[PDB]
Amino acid sequence: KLVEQLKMEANIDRIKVSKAAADLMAYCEAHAKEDPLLTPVPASENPFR
Amino acid sequence: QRNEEKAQREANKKIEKQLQKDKQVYRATHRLLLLGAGESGKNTIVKQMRITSGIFETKFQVDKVNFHMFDVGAQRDERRKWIQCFNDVTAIIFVVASSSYNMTNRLQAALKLFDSIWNNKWLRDTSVILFLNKQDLLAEKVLAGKSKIEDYFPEFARYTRVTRAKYFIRDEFLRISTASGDGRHYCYPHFTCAVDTENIRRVFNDCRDIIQRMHLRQYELL
Amino acid sequence: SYQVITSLLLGTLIFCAVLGNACVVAAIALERSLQNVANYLIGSLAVTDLMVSVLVLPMAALYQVLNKWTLGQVTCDLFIALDVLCCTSSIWHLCAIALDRYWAITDPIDYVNKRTPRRAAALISLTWLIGFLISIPPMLGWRTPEDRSDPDACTISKDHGYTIYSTFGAFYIPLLLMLVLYGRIFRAARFRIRKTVKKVNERNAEAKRKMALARERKTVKTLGIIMGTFILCWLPFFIVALVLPFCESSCHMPTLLGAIINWLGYSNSLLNPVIYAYFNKDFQNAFKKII
Amino acid sequence: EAEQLKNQIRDARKACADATLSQITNNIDPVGRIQMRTRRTLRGHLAKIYAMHWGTDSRLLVSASQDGKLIIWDSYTTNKVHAIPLRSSWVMTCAYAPSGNYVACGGLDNICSIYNLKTREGNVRVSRELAGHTGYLSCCRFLDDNQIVTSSGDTTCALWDIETGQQTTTFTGHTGDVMSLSLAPDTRLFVSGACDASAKLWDVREGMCRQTFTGHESDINAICFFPNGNAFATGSDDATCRLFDLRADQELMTYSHDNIICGITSVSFSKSGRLLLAGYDDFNCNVWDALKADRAGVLAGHDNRVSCLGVTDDGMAVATGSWDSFLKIWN
Ligand SMILES: CC(C)CCC[C@@H](C)[C@H]1CC[C@H]2[C@@H]3CC=C4C[C@@H](O)CC[C@]4(C)[C@H]3CC[C@]12C
Ligand SMILES: Cc1ccc(CNCC2(F)CCN(C(=O)c3ccc(F)c(Cl)c3)CC2)nc1
């Protein structure tokens, strides 16, 4: 019935989870230099005191 | 520099003043939650106490005590994960039609609903103002000779006609609060037909009683 | 030295009282869970007992140990007035607490509508006005300072009118006032426990009877603890301070039996937070937050 | 046919699992424990805090409480910009418009209430009322000043045109009520969490479910997108948090801890995405290393259950809202 149109997601192109892990860790490694939470920023540039 | 922040600070002071005033007004206002199916005597109680959304607010005052009333049956489904918003209420007005077991085993559903709501973790420290509305229809059905409450309370034969039958419905609702043994609150019905004027007076007396118990437990004279 | 076995005990008692009052006055201010009118009254009682423990208690110990009054020529009286002020304020705080409990229990509608913290502030003002009215008349002499001149000692004032006025205002009127208040809110509680049985199986009927009996026992135990503390601490001092001044012809009272009476009266400041604050469930759970 | 068509999806999902996230992120050593501490505290509200949202501008903040008050803070210097009177005191949701002009809230009143802060007379007044839902409103997010996507307890997500006030698009793919809803950074897709233990990726432009994720074992209470947009993180009552990827329909990482037996209330991501902060029932918020499941450290600081989490657009600060009527700002 309508579940047929709910289950039409069987045609999606699931790319390899290897590339998913790879570009996820690449995003984390590339953006770790601009994350104030990951490494505490100096109190000079911190707006919260 | 300083000029643009003094205005923000005084706006903060005014906002804090209004918030504190609103809390002070609210604290002198009572909290009550209603439960029970639509087949119960809920409509009569609400119609008396009034004089699309899942919450309807009926507010009033009796004997200089402000009441805020929340019927919550209009919330369609899944009471499980939003009932924590009502743990601060003083008491629950649980309305059950005592005459409605014949009219499916609806009274067993009322039993299980009462058992679920009394042993609720959020409402273990809250009283229950029970109701057993339209007792007159119960008397009419019992006097018919067939619609006795033993059909859906198969343990009636030991209890001690209309008064005898009505109190067993009262007492087996009390088993939920008594066998659990909360030790802080107690349950109490009030037989009402559709035209009794003492419902709001009974609720007011009950709220006064609950406040007295709270005071006697705070200073631990109870 | 003989002072050592006395100074050690007295200093330990004063330090324990200081800690007991300081914990309460800090825990009420730090936590907003305990910030209510009744606990505001209990906190005012705690700060009054702290004032007793840090102002008049250590010096009183200093006078007792040295046996002589040498800290000042005539400065004894000012201290006694402080002593009288703080002690009668601590006594009348119990009456204020009893009156607040009576008004809350008997009249719930008044509680809901008009039990503001302004009520606690007015009660504290009126409980310190009693000290202002009691400690001051002997400062200028009750009628005229003519007989209590003794540089070597520091004792309570014996003036003919004052030995009646002070002993009745500070203790006896509060004693019967608390008696009638905690009798009224005793029979009210007993009537309510009886109502919960009259208006309402073994696990049903016996449970009702046993919890009603337990509630009756529980309230009589609470009233017994409060009244026993008040009586056992203050009564001997305020019966000695009235019997003896009228029989100065044969005023004999052994020091080993009379000096203990002064300090039993004092120990009310230590024992007040033990029953009013420490044993209370709210503080019993709030003190867990500090570790 | 569709009752067994999920077999092909499951087979492809299992066969696509070639390299697990936990099997490859070992090229980076753990970042180490974080020393997060509270910088500001907020005490204006006087009842349980149920929701909170950060503006795109880093300055302001919004919080909704069950006392009938919606307030707008000032994070840098603790202050009140606006505190408005509500027409219903049963709100469990709030959202701040990216443009900085609108704020919305909703709850048990089955209604999305939208408040305009840029009134010509200055006073904040309600602008529109979105009452089409038949279940308690549980999540709300803004797309623009005339576009909004709403979650509710009627087992249906909705899309509302504020100008017309109509449910322009409806998402009926779920089988239970939905409580969490966050938009992708490219605001053309979004995901929703539900109590049927599933998360569904919604295609806004066609109004149809695209991918269904079935990792959690209980009711999902929180969901939020990875900053990239190709992934998102969830939070459920199973005392576990899970990370899902759109392009690879498996679960990349599962976050769990021995000292955790309580459900997750809110989740959010930092600017880089490596730090995932989740608020729990147990009074505190944990911080997780998203690539090795290492809990860097807890926040605590709340004497009642924390109900909402939010990381600033610049990622500088973390705000937490709890039922103790207190908001704490972390850094
Ligand atoms: C149970 C104890 C620890 C506290 C309660 C009892 C109090 C009132 C007792 C215990 C120790 C007692 C003191 C012990 C020693 C002396 C020296 C002597 O000149 C008698 C008075 C004096 C100064 C006593 C006064 C009363 C006293 C303080
Ligand atoms: C009205 C009243 C009077 C007295 C009291 C209790 N008062 C305790 C005393 F019995 C302690 C000793 N008394 C002193 O006056 C004193 C002597 C030496 C001192 F070093 C100090 Cl500090 C005080 C007399 C009062 N309640 C109410």
Residue numbers in the entry:
A (entry chain G): 14 to 62
B (entry chain A): 12 to 62, 204 to 255, 263 to 319, 333 to 394
C (entry chain R): 34 to 233, 325 to 415
D (entry chain B): 10 to 340
What does the paper say about this structure?
We observed several differences at the extracellular portions and in the binding poses of befiradol and ST171 in the 5-HT1AR-Gi complexes, which may explain their distinct signaling signatures. Both agonists show a bitopic binding mode occupying the conserved orthosteric pocket but addressing distinct allosteric sites of the 5-HT1AR.
In addition, we solved a structure of befiradol engaging the 5-HT1AR in complex with the Gs protein at a nominal resolution of 3.2 Å. The complex of befiradol with 5-HT1AR and the Gs protein revealed minor changes at the macromolecular and microswitch level, leading to similar orientations of the toggle switch residue W3586.48, the PIF and NPxxY motifs, and the break of the ionic lock. The densities for the 5-HT1AR-Gs complex suggest an extension of TM5 by one helical turn and a slight kink of TM6, even though cryo-EM data indicate variability at the intracellular ends of TM5 and TM6. Again, the methyl pyridinyl-substituted aminomethyl moiety of befiradol engages residues V1173.33, I1674.56, I18945.52, A2035.46, F3616.51, F3626.52, and A3656.55 in the orthosteric pocket through hydrophobic interactions. The distance of the charge-reinforced hydrogen bond between befiradol’s secondary amine and the Cγ of D1163.32 remained at 4.0 Å. At the extracellular side, the comparison of the befiradol-bound 5-HT1AR-Gi and 5-HT1AR-Gs complexes revealed a 1.8-Å outward movement of TM7, leading to a rearrangement of ECL3 and an increased distance between the carbonyl group of Q972.65 and the indole nitrogen of W3586.48. Substantial differences were observed in how befiradol’s 3-chloro-4-fluorobenzene group reaches the allosteric binding pocket in the complex of 5-HT1AR with the Gs protein. The carbonyl group shows a flipped orientation, now pointing toward TM3 instead of TM7, which requires a rotation of the side chain of I1133.29.
